[PDB]
């Protein structure tokens, strides 16, 4: 509007509807759509099945940690002096207990959040507020008076951004094309695609 | 337009080419005359053109220059304005930094390209990093803290600006698009909310008005904090008025608590220009919420408002520096029997105290009034919120008032002639809003 | 450079000394007294909130009970 | 302490001064100095008289211009002398005068 | 209501056509026009050059109305000091023609959020009409005050 | 002599300054005062609050007591020996009208009972 | 021991080697004190002296949550009132799950 | 105390400069102080913005800087006419019942007649009559109240 | 003399403290090569793995974070016993 | 298991602690100030009070 005397934007009408327009006469599409594994487990039905599934990944972050602390130790053991004590005694409860641990919150995050989505019924971000929560608590058992407040936040928070940026924007956004004419307005004269524009073919890597 | 435009670029460009000695008296005439190509611009801008008084393209959409409602008042408040931060500033690194930051956000009001507004803009993050960040005066803190605020939000408008020139093909305001996406109207929103300090987006504010000379903090608050309404009016509200309408209980929540937090923030105050800037955050509130209730009244409230603070606010830190600059003290403690010792300095701080409480006279009044009465439009109850709470504004101003009035002081520390030249524009401007001539 | 430390005692004599001190320790209000006194100050001054509310919920329960009458009445007629 | 030079410009301490009471003399108000009693005084407040009988009499041709009385007074009032836009009286009862 | 790409566009062609017609001939009041453009597009927005153009009427007739509230006020203010203590009912109807003047203009653009002004109470009297009918007829108890027959001095 | 007379001035600052000394209130005259008198330090005529609420307890009911008996108590037919001022029905009618008038409590008028709820009117507006 | 700095004339020459002190900008400023400037430097840097103990959580919680939540639950309330008395139906607001469409009032339309 | 000379239209008893203005010490032999830089650059370019504004405001035609200013002169013929025809409207209770039908289904109350008759020319009416959701009993009651 | 803000420790037990980073420094070649030969084979492995929900891959990036471990923190700690 | 936890510098001990030696400001003296918190006391009715106020005569 760009003046004082009326409210800016517009009003769409709600009754009057639009009969959708094919983008292009041909459509070709070069997203591959999600495999059965990814299906099977984001399958939330089975609590233990889903937290069996979904534990390997915190598994191998825990192994990765664990094997870098590990190797920081034993780079700065000396080779030229003998050393009394066992070197892999001394490395091997750092990388277990590293694993352990991760795969422990891991666990405690998919199972909570499976059972929230099961006794609920509905998938919703307060699934993964709970189940961070909960990780946050159990982290922050032992630790100082500021650490039990803010572990439960953070940890409640990563989900709420994986779900956010992760599901909900590119759902939100799928519309919009960039080729052609704007999604909103095909009234307006743009030059029409016969097919839609193949940037690349579908990844197989 | 043109010619105004004209004399923007002329500005920047003379300082190349002036003698190193001769240079304050050409930043200085160049001043002037921009401000009477905004006379000119203003004159040839017919009220019988509606939507936008003149627009200029010069061949290409980051070129689409115009000037609106908003616009005009803005670009006016900056140029009448720039010429008391010039005679403010000594040496030519100062004038050549000042300038550029004048030139940059001149050119920022009138833009009607989203992507070249953000050019324009953003280009004063530098010279603002250096001129808060300053030898001896200066706070790298206050520096850091501002670049960063700055360059997060607008990055994060850059984002939704990139987004909409995908989807739409254009990103010029001339063109009427709509959007209903929520990830969009943030990273728009997110600029507004920091640029016009929001609780909690203000923190950068304080510290860099403080540490900033005062030149530089005279044109922060008289025009940098409008540059939010200009974006808000031009590049919000026609493409996102369903989110603003959508967030409009979290939008009142975060502007009520804005307004109440920053009013009592500005109690525990000591020093006189941490005083002024926590009243800019109390006062940037009431500004937002009108706008965002995308009505007649509130538009106009909301930019008469600015207006009147752009002549308040400015006063009272030309105050503040003279101040300063004869005690070399900001602590109100230290401050006393200004009365007594600075009869003409006093009288002038006084008005220009009265002008921030909002009283009839003065150009707050009218603007207050207004902007209630838009508040009053969508509920009383948002009306009642943000008057009933005004008197903490009072509460803090006659607690300083009070303690600088009176006491024992053994040094006399009133204005030269060069400090009542430097406010009487100020002065009259004040005195003419107030009458009615908004 | 920084100003004196040393007081006037000329004026002791006529208006008394400065021995006597203030006994004030400048601490603040208890967290337990300011939450009950914020929890209470607040809702007075926001006296029309809950007069807004009273009334609309009046309001609101009368349609409600006037809906139910007369769907009772439109039922059996 | 040897006066400044200075205050040789500077005006003395007024008659209404106490004589013990100190104030710089330095100090400017636009409101007068601590005592005043400046020499011209009388022919500063004839010349402010004439200009406020000079405004009274702008203001009374302004006032006299906007002064709407759309009812007419019971009686007869002073400002029909003056203006000429006065209804005519009409009593209670409803005569007119 | 469902609407046709092929009406669309032509809908579209007819508009440039009218543009074409106003382009022909220079006018000084292009931007307070007295006519709208009429339409049945879901969304203004879809037509720049009809958004604009209804832009502009309706701030036309915005400024229109709200002088026409100022004439209305003046001759409300002129009426109830030239009556005296008969005000009350001598000024009933001008009072109802400024009310409605007030309400057409504040209520016409409104905005979003904003709420109708319910110059004279018109709104609370009727829904206290509808209550007590309401009450009445159904036997229950109204907790509300009955209807009245003057709020204000007009509405 | 109202102007000349002596004063006492405030001794300078010697020891570390308490964190909230701006509750204080110091012009460099001797006596200073707190922000509000009362907040802490002497109080005036040794009274502290708990004094005050006592004797405000003790006082508030003899002060109450005349209020509580019309309006509560009393009726409005045997409030006064007399009725309402009695008006033409023109302007009784208008003069009924007003909310905060007193012709509404004429219960000899039949209209007693819509006055009556009238009077009881809408604590905010419904638009 | 003093001297006029300014020169009205125009003639005005800073004496830098004079013996008297000039009557410069610098006659006039006020002198600090070295505990009020402590007590400067303890007010602005009072960072240092934060720690996150229960009565503090309980403090910002109780007086800023507490606010942000009275604030939200009124315009929630003002909202849900305007919707009422405008007519419209209930508005499809961010965290309100509501499973209407409806945001925007049609200009056109008469509700 | 009392007066100088116990007469109260007596000369001042001070003779000198009441204070300093701006600090500024007058010259021994009267001479003018020499003017700053900026003075004559600042009185022209302020003195030059402010009376352009006052001719701007005063000087230019009704509508090009003030637009309520234009639209004065229609708002009283659109007064008359809808004078004229609130009249015709209190006149005919045929008319009346016709509205009293046109607002319900307008979601208009009774009260809203008024505001029907002043809103004959308006975005809303106007483009729900072509539309179809205004009913066209209102086009033909407004011609026969000369529209 | 100005205010300062005020250090917390002693000034020798803080020197010590800062000096038990004084400690032969192993040259990070080796533990290059060791990321570089099992980052390659992680690539290679990672083209196999499963495909996870966006949630459990920020919250494995979280956990990662919170138990990756400074290259400094265990240099300052490192004892050569049992 | 080391953490992010153990090395991030959690603020639960302030690192500046105030002066103990505090100044108080220099106020008038009162002799008695004890604050009276009964209204209803047996010293307004004091026999002492009673002679020195109440029963001479004026
Ligand atoms: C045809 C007929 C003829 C008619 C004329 C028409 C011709 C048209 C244009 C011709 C004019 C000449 C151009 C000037 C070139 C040199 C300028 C310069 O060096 O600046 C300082 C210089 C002052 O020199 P100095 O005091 O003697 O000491 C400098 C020493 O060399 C070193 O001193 P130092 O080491 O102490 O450094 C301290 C530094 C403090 O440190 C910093 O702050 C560094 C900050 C980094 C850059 C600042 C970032 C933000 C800058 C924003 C741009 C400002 C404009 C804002 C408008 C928004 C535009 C989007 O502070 C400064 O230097 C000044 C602060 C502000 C100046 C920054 C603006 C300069 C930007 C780039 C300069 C161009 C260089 C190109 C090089 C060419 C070959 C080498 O010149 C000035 O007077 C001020 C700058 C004037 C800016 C106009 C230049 C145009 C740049 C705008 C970009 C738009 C695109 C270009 C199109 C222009 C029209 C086509
Ligand atoms: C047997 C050989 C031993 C090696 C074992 C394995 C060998 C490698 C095999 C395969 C390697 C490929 C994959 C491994 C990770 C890729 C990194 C890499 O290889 O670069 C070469 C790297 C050395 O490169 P460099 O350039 O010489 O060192 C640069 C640093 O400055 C180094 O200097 P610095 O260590 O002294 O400084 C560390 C600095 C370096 O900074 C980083 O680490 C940046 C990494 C940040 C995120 C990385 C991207 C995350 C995206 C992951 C993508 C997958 C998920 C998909 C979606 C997730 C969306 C984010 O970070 C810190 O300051 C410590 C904090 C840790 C992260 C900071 C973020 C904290 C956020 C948490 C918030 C909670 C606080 C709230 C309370 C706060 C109170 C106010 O080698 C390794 O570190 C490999 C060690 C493997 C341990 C990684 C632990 C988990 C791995 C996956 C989790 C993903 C997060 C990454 C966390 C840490 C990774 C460094
Ligand atoms: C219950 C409230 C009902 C009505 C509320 C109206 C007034 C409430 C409190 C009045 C405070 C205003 C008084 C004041 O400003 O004067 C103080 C100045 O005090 C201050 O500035 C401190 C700030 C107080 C202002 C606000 C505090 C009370 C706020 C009310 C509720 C708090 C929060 C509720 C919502 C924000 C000076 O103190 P005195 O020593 O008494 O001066 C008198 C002169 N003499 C020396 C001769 C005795
Ligand atoms: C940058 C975003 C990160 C959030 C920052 C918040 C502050 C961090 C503090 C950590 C707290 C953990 C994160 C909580 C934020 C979520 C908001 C809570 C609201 C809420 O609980 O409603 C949920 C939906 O909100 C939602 O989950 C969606 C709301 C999106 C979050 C807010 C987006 C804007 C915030 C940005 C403010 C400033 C940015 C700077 C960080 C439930 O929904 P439901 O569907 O489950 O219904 C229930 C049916 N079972
Ligand atoms: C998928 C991702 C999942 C989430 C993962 C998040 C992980 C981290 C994200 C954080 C990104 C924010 C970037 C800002 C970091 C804070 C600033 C750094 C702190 C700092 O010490 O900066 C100093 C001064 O900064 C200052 O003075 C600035 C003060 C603080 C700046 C406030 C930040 C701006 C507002 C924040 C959000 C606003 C809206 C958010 C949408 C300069 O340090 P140095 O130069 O001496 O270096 C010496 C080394 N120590
Ligand atoms: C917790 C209180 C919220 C704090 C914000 C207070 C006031 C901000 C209002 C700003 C006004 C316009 C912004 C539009 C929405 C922003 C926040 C609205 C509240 C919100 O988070 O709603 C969510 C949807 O918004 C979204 O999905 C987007 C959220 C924002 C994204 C965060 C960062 C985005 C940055 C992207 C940069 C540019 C990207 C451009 C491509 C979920 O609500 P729901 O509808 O699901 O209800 C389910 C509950 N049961
Ligand atoms: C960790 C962070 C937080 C932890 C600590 C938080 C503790 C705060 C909890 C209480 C805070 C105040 C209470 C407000 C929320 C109460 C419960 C919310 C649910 C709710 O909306 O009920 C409404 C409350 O009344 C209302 O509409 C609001 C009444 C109270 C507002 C006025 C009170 C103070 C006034 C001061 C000014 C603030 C507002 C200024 C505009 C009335 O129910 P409904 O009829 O709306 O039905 C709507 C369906 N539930
Ligand atoms: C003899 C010499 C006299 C010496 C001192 C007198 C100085 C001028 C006295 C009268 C001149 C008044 C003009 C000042 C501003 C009035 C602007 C104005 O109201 O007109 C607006 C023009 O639009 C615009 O956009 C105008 C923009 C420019 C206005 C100034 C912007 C602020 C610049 C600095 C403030 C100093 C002002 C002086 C539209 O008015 P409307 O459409 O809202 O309807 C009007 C009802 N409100």
């Given at each position: 509007?760009?003046?004082?005397?009326?409210?800016?934007?517009?009003?769409?009408?709600?009754?009057?509807?639009?009969?959708?327009?094919?983008?292009?006469?041909?459509?070709?599409?070069?997203?591959?759509?999600?495999?059965?594994?990814?299906?099977?487990?984001?399958?939330?039905?089975?609590?233990?099945?889903?937290?069996?599934?979904?534990?390997?990944?915190?598994?191998?972050?825990?192994?990765?940690?664990?094997?870098?602390?590990?190797?920081?130790?034993?780079?700065?053991?000396?080779?030229?002096?003998?050393?009394?004590?066992?070197?892999?005694?001394?490395?091997?409860?750092?990388?277990?207990?590293?694993?352990?641990?991760?795969?422990?919150?891991?666990?405690?995050?998919?199972?909570?959040?499976?059972?929230?989505?099961?006794?609920?019924?509905?998938?919703?971000?307060?699934?993964?507020?709970?189940?961070?929560?909960?990780?946050?608590?159990?982290?922050?058992?032992?630790?100082?008076?500021?650490?039990p407040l803010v572990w439960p936040l953070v940890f409640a928070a990563a989900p709420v951004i994986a779900d956010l940026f992760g599901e909900v924007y590119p759902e939100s956004m799928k519309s919009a094309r960039g080729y052609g004419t704007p999604y909103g307005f095909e009234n307006l004269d743009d030059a029409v695609p016969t097919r839609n524009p193949i940037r690349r073919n579908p990844h197989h890597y | 337009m043109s010619l105004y435009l004209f004399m923007l670029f002329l500005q920047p460009l003379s300082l190349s080419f002036v003698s190193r000695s001769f240079s304050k008296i050409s930043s200085l005439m160049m001043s002037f005359a921009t401000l009477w190509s905004a006379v000119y611009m203003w004159f040839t801008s017919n009220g019988a053109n509606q939507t936008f008084y003149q627009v200029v393209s010069w061949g290409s959409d980051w070129s689409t220059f115009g000037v609106c409602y908003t616009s005009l008042y803005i670009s006016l408040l900056c140029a009448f304005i720039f010429p008391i931060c010039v005679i403010l500033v000594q040496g030519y690194r100062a004038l050549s930094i000042l300038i550029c930051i004048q030139t940059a956000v001149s050119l920022s009001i009138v833009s009607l390209?989203?992507?070249?507004?953000?050019?324009?803009?953003?280009?004063?993050?530098?010279?603002?990093?250096?001129?808060?960040?300053?030898?001896?005066?200066?706070?790298?803190?206050?520096?850091?803290?501002?670049?960063?605020?700055?360059?997060?939000?607008?990055?994060?408008?850059?984002?939704?600006?990139?987004?909409?020139?995908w989807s739409f093909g254009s990103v010029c305001a001339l063109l009427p698009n709509e959007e209903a996406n929520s990830f969009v109207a943030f990273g728009i929103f997110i600029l507004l909310w920091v640029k016009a300090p929001l609780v909690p987006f203000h923190l950068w504010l304080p510290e860099a008005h403080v540490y900033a000379p005062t030149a530089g903090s005279v044109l922060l608050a008289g025009v940098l904090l409008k540059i939010s309404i200009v974006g808000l009016h031009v590049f919000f509200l026609p493409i996102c008025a369903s989110s603003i309408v959508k967030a409009f209980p979290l939008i009142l929540s975060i502007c009520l608590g804005s307004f109440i937090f920053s009013s009592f923030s500005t109690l525990k105050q000591?020093?006189?220009?941490?005083?002024?800037?926590?009243?800019?955050?109390?006062?940037?509130?009431?500004?937002?919420?009108?706008?965002?209730?995308?009505?007649?009244?509130?538009?106009?409230?909301?930019?008469?408002?600015?207006?009147?603070?752009?002549?308040?606010?400015?006063?009272?830190?030309?105050?503040?520096?003279?101040?300063?600059?004869?005690?070399?003290?900001?602590?109100?403690?230290?401050?006393?029997?200004?009365?007594?010792?600075?009869?003409?300095?006093?009288?002038?701080?006084?008005?220009?105290?009265?002008?921030?409480?909002?009283?009839?006279?003065?150009?707050?009044?009218?603007?207050?009034?207004?902007?209630?009465?838009?508040?009053?439009?969508?509920?009383?109850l948002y009306a009642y919120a943000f008057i009933f709470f005004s008197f903490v504004g009072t509460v803090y101003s006659s607690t300083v008032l009070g303690r600088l009035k009176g006491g024992v002081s053994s040094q006399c520390v009133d204005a030269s002639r060069l400090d009542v030249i430097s406010w009487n524009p100020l002065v009259l401007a004040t005195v003419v809003t107030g009458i009615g001539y908004m | 450079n920084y100003a004196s430390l040393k007081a006037d005692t000329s004026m002791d004599h006529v208006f008394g000394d400065s021995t006597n001190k203030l006994n004030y320790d400048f601490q603040l209000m208890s967290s337990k007294e300011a939450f009950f006194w914020n929890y209470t100050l607040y809702p007075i001054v926001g006296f029309p909130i809950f007069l807004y509310l009273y009334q609309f919920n009046k309001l609101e329960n009368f349609e409600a009970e006037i809906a139910a009458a007369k769907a009772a009445k439109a039922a059996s007629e | 302490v040897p006066e400044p030079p200075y205050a040789k410009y500077?005006?003395?301490?007024?008659?209404?001064?106490?004589?013990?009471?100190?104030?710089?003399?330095?100090?400017?108000?636009?409101?007068?100095?601590?005592?005043?009693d400046p020499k011209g005084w009388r022919t500063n407040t004839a010349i402010a008289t004439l200009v406020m009988l000079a405004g009274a009499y702008a203001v009374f041709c302004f006032g006299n211009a906007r002064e709407e009385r759309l009812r007419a007074p019971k009686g007869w009032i002073p400002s029909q002398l003056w203006n000429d836009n006065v209804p005519t009286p009409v009593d209670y009862r409803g005569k007119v005068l | 209501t469902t609407a046709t790409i092929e009406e669309r566009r032509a809908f579209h062609k007819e508009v440039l056509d009218i543009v074409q017609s106003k382009l022909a001939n220079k006018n000084s009041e292009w931007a307070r026009p007295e006519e709208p453009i009429l339409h049945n597009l879901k969304s203004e927005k879809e037509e720049p050059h009809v958004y604009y153009h209804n832009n502009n009427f309706r701030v036309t007739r915005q400024l229109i109305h709200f002088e026409k509230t100022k004439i209305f006020e003046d001759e409300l203010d002129k009426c109830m000091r030239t009556h005296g203590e008969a005000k009350y009912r001598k000024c009933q109807e001008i009072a109802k023609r400024f009310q409605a003047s007030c309400r057409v203009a504040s209520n016409l653009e409104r905005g979003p959020n904003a709420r109708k002004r319910d110059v004279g109470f018109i709104y609370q009297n009727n829904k206290l009409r509808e209550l007590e009918k309401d009450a009445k007829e159904l036997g229950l108890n109204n907790p509300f005050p009955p209807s009245s027959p003057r709020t204000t001095i007009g509405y | 002599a109202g102007a000349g007379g002596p004063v006492k001035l405030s001794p300078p600052v010697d020891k570390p300054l308490p964190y909230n000394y701006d509750f204080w209130?110091?012009?460099?005259?001797?006596?200073?005062?707190?922000?509000?008198?009362?907040?802490?330090?002497?109080?005036?005529?040794?009274?502290?609050?708990?004094?005050?609420?006592?004797?405000?307890?003790?006082?508030?009911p003899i002060l109450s007591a005349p209020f509580v008996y019309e309006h509560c108590i009393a009726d409005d037919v045997t409030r006064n020996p007399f009725v309402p001022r009695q008006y033409p029905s023109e302007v009784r009618e208008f003069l009924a009208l007003f909310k905060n008038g007193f012709v509404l409590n004429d219960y000899s008028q039949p209209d007693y009972e819509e006055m009556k709820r009238r009077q009881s009117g809408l604590l905010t507006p419904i638009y | 021991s003093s001297r006029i700095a300014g020169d009205t004339?125009?003639?005005?020459?800073?004496?830098?080697?004079?013996?008297?002190?000039?009557?410069?900008?610098?006659?006039?400023?006020?002198?600090?004190?070295?505990?009020?400037?402590?007590?400067?430097?303890?007010?602005?840097?009072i960072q240092r002296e934060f720690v996150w103990t229960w009565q503090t959580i309980f403090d910002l919680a109780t007086f800023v949550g507490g606010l942000y939540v009275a604030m939200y639950a009124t315009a929630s309330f003002c909202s849900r009132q305007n919707d009422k008395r405008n007519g419209y139906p209930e508005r499809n607001y961010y965290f309100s799950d509501s499973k209407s469409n409806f945001v925007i009032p049609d200009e056109r339309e008469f509700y | 105390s009392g007066h100088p000379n116990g007469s109260f239209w007596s000369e001042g008893t001070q003779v000198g400069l009441n204070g300093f203005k701006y600090g500024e010490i007058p010259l021994p032999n009267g001479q003018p102080r020499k003017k700053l830089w900026l003075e004559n650059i600042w009185n022209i370019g302020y003195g030059g913005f402010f009376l352009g504004a006052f001719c701007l405001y005063y000087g230019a035609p009704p509508g090009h800087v003030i637009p309520s200013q234009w639209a004065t002169p229609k708002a009283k013929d659109e007064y008359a006419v809808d004078m004229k025809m609130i009249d015709k409207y209190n006149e005919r209770p045929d008319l009346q019942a016709r509205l009293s039908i046109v607002l319900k289904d307008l979601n208009m109350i009774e009260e809203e007649a008024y505001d029907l008759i002043m809103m004959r020319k308006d975005y809303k009416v106007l483009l729900g009559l072509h539309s179809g959701r205004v009913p066209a009993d209102l086009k033909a009651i407004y011609e026969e109240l000369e529209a | 003399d100005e205010p300062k803000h005020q250090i917390p420790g002693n000034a020798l037990d803080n020197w010590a403290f800062l000096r038990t980073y004084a400690k032969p420094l192993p040259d990070m070649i080796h533990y290059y090569y060791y990321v570089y030969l099992f980052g390659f084979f992680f690539v290679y492995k990672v083209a196999d793995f499963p495909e996870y929900s966006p949630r459990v891959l920020v919250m494995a990036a979280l956990i990662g974070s919170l138990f990756y471990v400074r290259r400094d923190w265990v240099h300052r700690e490192f004892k050569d016993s049992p | 298991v080391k953490t992010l936890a153990?090395?991030?510098?959690?603020?639960?001990?302030?690192?500046?602690?105030?002066?103990?030696?505090?100044?108080?400001?220099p106020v008038p003296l009162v002799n008695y100030d004890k604050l009276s918190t009964q209204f209803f006391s047996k010293l307004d009715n004091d026999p002492v009070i009673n002679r020195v106020l109440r029963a001479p005569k004026v």
């Open positions: 509007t760009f003046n004082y005397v009326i409210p800016y934007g517009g009003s769409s009408s709600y009754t009057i509807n639009n009969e959708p327009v094919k983008a292009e006469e041909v459509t070709v599409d070069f997203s591959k759509e999600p495999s059965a594994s990814s299906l099977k487990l984001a399958d939330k039905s089975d609590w233990i099945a889903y937290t069996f599934n979904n534990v390997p990944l915190m598994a191998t972050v825990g192994l990765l940690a664990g094997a870098h602390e590990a190797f920081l130790h034993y780079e700065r053991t000396p080779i030229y002096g003998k050393r009394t004590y066992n070197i892999i005694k001394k490395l091997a409860p750092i990388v277990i207990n590293k694993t352990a641990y991760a795969t422990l919150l891991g666990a405690i995050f998919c199972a909570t959040d499976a059972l929230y989505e099961n006794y609920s019924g509905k998938k919703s971000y307060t699934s993964g507020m709970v189940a961070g929560a909960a990780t946050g608590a159990v982290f922050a058992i032992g630790r100082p008076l500021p650490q | 390209h989203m992507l070249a507004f953000y050019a324009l803009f953003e280009s004063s993050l530098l010279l603002f990093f250096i001129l808060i960040g300053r030898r001896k005066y200066g706070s790298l803190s206050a520096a850091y803290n501002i670049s960063i605020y700055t360059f997060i939000s607008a990055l994060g408008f850059l984002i939704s600006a990139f987004w909409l020139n000591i020093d006189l220009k941490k005083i002024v800037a926590y009243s800019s955050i109390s006062h940037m509130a009431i500004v937002f919420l009108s706008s965002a209730t995308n009505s007649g009244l509130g538009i106009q409230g909301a930019v008469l408002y600015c207006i009147a603070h752009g002549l308040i606010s400015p006063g009272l830190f030309l105050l503040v520096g003279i101040l300063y600059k004869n005690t070399n003290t900001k602590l109100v403690f230290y401050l006393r029997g200004l009365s007594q010792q600075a009869p003409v300095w006093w009288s002038v701080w006084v008005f220009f105290m009265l002008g921030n409480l909002a009283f009839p006279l003065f150009p707050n009044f009218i603007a207050e009034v207004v902007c209630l009465s838009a508040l009053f439009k969508n509920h009383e | - | 500077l005006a003395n301490k007024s008659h209404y001064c106490p004589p013990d009471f100190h104030y710089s003399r330095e100090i400017y108000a636009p409101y007068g100095g601590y005592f005043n | - | 209130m110091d012009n460099g005259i001797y006596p200073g005062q707190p922000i509000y008198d009362g907040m802490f330090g002497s109080m005036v005529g040794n009274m502290s609050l708990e004094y005050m609420a006592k004797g405000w307890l003790v006082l508030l | 004339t125009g003639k005005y020459t800073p004496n830098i080697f004079s013996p008297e002190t000039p009557m410069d900008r610098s006659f006039s400023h006020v002198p600090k004190n070295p505990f009020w400037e402590a007590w400067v430097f303890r007010r602005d840097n | - | - | 153990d090395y991030i510098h959690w603020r639960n001990k302030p690192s500046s602690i105030p002066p103990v030696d505090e100044y108080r400001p």
